[PDB]
């Protein structure tokens, strides 16, 4: 089911930023990944960020302009974007990948609308 509730999203004009929020009920566990990806309509999704639990962080202009980072305490990973650019358009999506079955957990997605 939704185990993963994103907020966050809205439209922003260009050169404004937006922070992303994804939080994870209590049924998620074991959880060695936490990604963020996107999918703008008639497109494929894309990846946009990653953490991988062992400390590691990556960000597939999304290098340097978005920023992945959690709050243990809170059971949140976040998606900072700065600069947005018309094209970032999309509907972006968390993700939580565990070592042990139901194995992936998508989030149900929030709007980023970049329109001046």
């Known amino acids: 089911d939704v185990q993963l509730v994103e907020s966050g999203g809205g439209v922003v004009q260009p050169g404004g930023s937006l922070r992303l929020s994804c939080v994870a009920s209590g049924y998620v566990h074991k959880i060695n990944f936490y990604g963020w990806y996107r999918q703008a309509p008639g497109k494929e999704r894309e990846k946009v960020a990653h953490?991988?639990?062992?400390?590691?962080?990556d960000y597939a202009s999304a290098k340097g302009r978005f920023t992945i980072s959690r709050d243990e305490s809170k059971n949140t990973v976040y998606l900072q974007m700065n600069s947005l650019r018309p094209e970032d358009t999309a509907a972006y999506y968390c993700?939580?990948?565990?070592?042990?079955?139901?194995?992936?957990?998508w989030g149900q997605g929030t709007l980023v609308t970049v329109s001046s």
């Open positions: 953490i991988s639990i062992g400390d590691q962080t």
């Open positions: 993700r939580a990948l565990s070592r042990i079955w139901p194995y992936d957990y």
